[PDB]
Design a protein around this ligand. Structure first.
Ligand code: VHN
Ligand code: VHN
Ligand code: CL
Ligand code: CL
Ligand code: CL
Ligand code: CL
Lengths: 125, 5, 125, 5
């Protein structure tokens, strides 16, 4: 109905709780392997944030996998920064990590992150 | 909070 | 780090995608039964929104259940309205449903919804 | 959108 009222903070409060479940390893259902590093997560949050994970977990065979191995060229710190962004809306973008973050966001298909990386790089040229 | 969206 | 940047719309965009997955029945992992009605959902979203579901799905036996039956006194339309609110931040509160919505939100332990129901009822006294 | 939170 068009007569709904809306609770402004609801979406951010849901995301905070999903991150608390991730921190406590509650109902995590996939491990993402990035070279020597493993990251536990919820498939639904990954799909909701990434075009690559949306494609992976909607595939009729890959939806059932409990381990996903990323391309060996992917930087684990870049992936960690993006996984934290998925669960918090906050991106720890620094001069020392921006190239790895942008490459990882292009691979994961995270357009808004790629856009802000491109802008920060362009400002330093 | 609540608002008219 | 405290040097993070934040994408304002991220949390609302994640919630929109979680609702799209719910609509398409993608990776839903529980059925909530409310008398004669069944509602498919994601356990993590339910836990993130409700004190009752947070308690249920953190229990070492109930976390593994694929069907949860609610108390027979719970109104299915009231539950449906609250499940839609969990996934959208929008509450379809009407004169004809407010009593059932408030009773259901008290049972589910959804404090902000109970508070707005109490205010709307108090305004009509 | 991006802001300083
Ligand atoms: C133009 N390219 C695209 O649309 C690619 C295929 N997708 C994304 C790209 C992107 O940059 N970010 C996404 C974030 C979430 C999602 N996830 C979704 C997008 C739409 N509906 C749903 Cl149900 C989901 C989920 N979960 C996708 C992208
Ligand atoms: C005072 N009573 C409480 O704190 C009760 C036990 N809980 C809630 C109550 C409530 O009104 N809303 C919640 C919403 C989400 C959640 N879910 C969580 C709360 C805290 N940490 C986590 Cl990880 C979750 C989740 N998922 C709980 C409540
Ligand atoms: Cl597997
Ligand atoms: Cl993004
Ligand atoms: Cl079961
Ligand atoms: Cl609430």
């Amino acid at each position: 109905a068009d007569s709904c009222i809306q609770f402004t903070r609801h979406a951010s409060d849901v995301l905070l709780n999903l991150n608390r479940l991730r921190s406590r390893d509650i109902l995590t259902d996939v491990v993402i392997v990035v070279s020597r590093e493993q990251f536990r997560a919820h498939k639904t949050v990954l799909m909701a944030c990434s075009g690559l994970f949306y494609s992976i977990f909607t595939d009729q065979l890959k939806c059932n996998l409990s381990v996903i191995n990323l391309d060996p060229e992917i930087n684990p710190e870049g992936f960690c920064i993006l996984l934290d962004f998925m669960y918090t809306s906050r991106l720890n973008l620094r001069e020392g990590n921006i190239m790895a973050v942008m490459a990882t966001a292009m691979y994961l298909q995270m357009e808004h992150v790629v856009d802000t990386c491109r802008k920060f790089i362009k400002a330093s040229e | 909070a609540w608002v008219i969206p």
